[PDB]
Amino acid sequence: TRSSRAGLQFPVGRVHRLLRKGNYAERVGAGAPVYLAAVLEYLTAEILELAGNAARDNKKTRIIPRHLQLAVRNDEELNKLLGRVTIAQGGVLPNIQSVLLPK
Template sequence: MAAGAGRGKAAGKKATSRSSKAGLQFPVGRIARFLKSGKYAERVGAGAPVYLAAVLEYLAAEVLELAGNAARDNKKNRIVPRHIQLAVRNDEELSKLLGHVTIANGGVLPNIHSVLLPTKKTTGCNVPFYVFAQDNYVVKP
């Protein structure tokens, strides 16, 4: 009998994790343990932790891809919470999913209300005038 092989096990057979069987990076065994110890239900099926691990891995990959794009747009090599915030809030579905979530050190989306922006007007002599929408104050350039 080979070392490491117990009763009923074939000699020399290496153990494979459920994560590798499912082709996932997230730990299926750990998620199964959390589901069982968390008392979410009396019993947990065999496929439930695999499915949950796949969903969590997909969401993490989606957020990381968008955050990486946001970091590259800002000419940075490292993803910081600001990039995660920009990625989540600019994506419609992720923003809806994480609508009530606060990301620490994330900041806010850059947004200037259209009323506060100067409106450009042209006169008959093709000289641009800038009229501010609130109090009609005219400034010549």
């Protein structure tokens, strides 16, 4: 395999195939699948990191959508990246406007 040769856990061959079959360009180099797989693996590592953190904070062993939503929205950069994404069964962050609070 090539994920092994690049220390990656994401399938390099799958990415190379999808890159050809997606009609993105006439020819596809050799580095591109490895690079794209590495970037995807890093991003999902970040997401899983923060979601597991959240699940620990909520005292759960298995990650459910709500943890993903909390990890994404609480994180500034991930929230920006998923600026136009609604996560199913995600819910919203707890946020109450000042003036609405009792005096």
